[PDB]
């Protein structure tokens, strides 16, 4: 049996983080917490979710189980759950998922996990630049950039960290030195990315949440978001855009 109780904010956060890339997904309930990951059908972005058991108000299982969930459905339902509302997820039989909150009980057919596209493997990315800042700031920088290009460049060296976008008539540049960042190794890196993925990523973060960036040169970027008061960890890995002829 699986019987956990979490807050609405926590549940609404992972369903969104996930649904942003995939429609169905394998959710793993492990001894140390909830885990899940998927790659969007573009084969461009990857999201890895981890919610440690202590984040849950209650987290009971008899063994480590894996379930196939229709995320579009869970997302749709979580809109009815309130932020400060407490929600109970229950999996008694092996074919239906129960979601409780308020005076409502929602049931849904599970998907045979084996039927869902085998999840990808957690990559091994050793990268130069390491940046830790407020997700809120990052969010604003991307939004500004979004008004200029469909792509931005993440640049990094001893001077600091920079996000830049270029139009044919104007440009915009975001910049922070070690003094302003929470942590900064001054590593050297440069990569280009699509602004649209970054915005979609930022939809699950706000001011006060921590963001850790792992950046390299012409390599995927690691955006590790720590949300809901440090109760959840949502990691997005995005493939880069490549210039050529």
């Amino acid at each position: 049996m699986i019987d956990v109780i979490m807050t609405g904010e926590l549940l609404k956060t992972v369903t969104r983080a996930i649904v942003a890339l995939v429609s169905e997904a394998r959710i793993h309930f492990l001894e140390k917490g909830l885990h899940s990951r998927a790659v969007d059908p573009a084969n461009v972005a990857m999201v890895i979710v981890d919610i440690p058991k202590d984040s849950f108000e209650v987290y009971n299982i008899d063994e480590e189980k894996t379930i196939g969930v229709d995320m579009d459905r869970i997302f749709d339902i979580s809109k009815s759950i309130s932020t400060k509302d407490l929600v109970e997820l229950i999996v008694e039989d092996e074919s239906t998922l129960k979601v409780k909150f308020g005076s409502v009980e929602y049931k849904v057919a599970l998907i045979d996990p084996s039927a869902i596209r085998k999840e990808p493997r957690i990559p091994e990315l050793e990268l130069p630049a390491k940046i830790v800042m407020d997700a809120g700031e990052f969010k604003k920088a991307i939004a500004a950039a979004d008004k200029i290009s469909d792509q931005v460049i993440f640049r990094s060296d001893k001077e600091g960290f920079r996000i830049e976008a270029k139009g044919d008539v104007d440009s915009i540049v975001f910049h922070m030195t070690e003094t302003e960042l929470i942590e900064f190794n001054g590593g050297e890196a440069r990569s280009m990315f699509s602004v649209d993925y970054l915005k979609e990523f930022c939809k699950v973060a706000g001011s006060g949440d921590l963001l850790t960036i792992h950046l390299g040169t012409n390599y995927p970027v690691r955006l590790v978001f720590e949300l809901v008061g440090g109760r959840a960890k949502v990691e997005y890995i995005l493939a880069p855009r490549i210039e050529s002829e």
């Binding site: 461009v44 792509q151 890995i237």
Partner: peptide, 12 residues
């Protein structure tokens, strides 16, 4: 030009 790379170009 500008192309979008696939994620498995690196996890390969």
């Amino acid at each position: 030009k500008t192309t979008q790379s696939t994620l498995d170009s690196f996890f390969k």
